[PDB]
Amino acid sequence: GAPATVTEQGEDITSKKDRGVLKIVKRVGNGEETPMIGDKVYVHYKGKLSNGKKFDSSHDRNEPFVFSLGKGQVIKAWDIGVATMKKGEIAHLLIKPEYAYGSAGSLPKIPSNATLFFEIELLDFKGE
Ligand SMILES: C=C[C@H]1CN(Cc2ccccn2)C(=O)[C@@H]2CCC[C@H]1N2[S@](=O)c1cc(Cl)cc(Cl)c1
């Protein structure tokens, strides 16, 4: 399925080249510009654990998730990954725990040492 495919066929987008965050572009977005640090970014996403369970979805809430890029308001992989996306792009990310919740995990659903899968859509990005 999609998690296996990004595991086996994704591109390493980390600065360290440690394979901690792999990406596939599923839908090409608009033009060449990616967001800049501090931009307000609007995303839709779904996340799955390695046991196949969906653990989160913005679609199911009927509202996007909004954060300021590059500020550690999200897991490291999201700051790295969304920074690579164009407006309108849909991507898959496959994230080792060092770029997510590490050994701590995150109650209630994310265990220790969890590799995570996301599908993300970058809806919009704006400076403030
Ligand atoms: C509102 C949910 C955010 C939570 N965070 C930031 C964060 C803040 C505080 C505690 C744990 N994570 C995040 O960095 C990432 C990426 C952005 C989307 C969501 N998460 S994960 O999908 C997530 C989903 C759910 Cl249901 C619970 C948790 Cl602990 C984490």
**In 3D, which of 48, 65, 63, 57 has the Cα closest to residue 100?**
48
Does the annotation count 65 as an active-site position? no
The structure tokens listed for 88 are 């309108």
Element (H, E) at 5: helix 2-9
Residue 38 one-letter amino acid: G
> What's the 53 CA to ligand 1 centre distance in angstroms?
15
Q: Could you give the 3-state DSSP secondary structure of residue 6?
A: helix
> Hey, which residues does 121 pair with through a beta bridge?
44, 90
Q: Is 67 in the pocket of ligand 1 (CB under 6 A)?
A: no
Name the residue type at position 24.
I
What is the rounded CA–CA span in Å between residue 14 and residue 44?
Answer: 22
Q: Region of 120 please: left (phi>0), alpha (psi -120 to 50) or beta.
A: beta
Q: Which of 13, 42, 75, 99 is catalytic?
A: 75
E strands in 29-75: 40-48, 54-57, 65-68
Domain that holds residue 22: 1-128
- Find the catalytic residue in 42, 99, 101, 117: 101
Measured over the CA atoms of residue 22, residue 54, residue 67 and residue 63, the dihedral's sign is positive
d(CA 122, CA 29): 9
- The number of distinct structural domains making up the chain is 1
Q: 56 in ligand 1 pocket by Cβ < 6 Å?
A: yes
Q: How was this structure determined?
A: X-ray
Rounded to whole angstroms, the Cα distance separating 79 from 64 reads 16
CA neighbor of 25 nearest in space, from 123, 125, 120, 124: 120
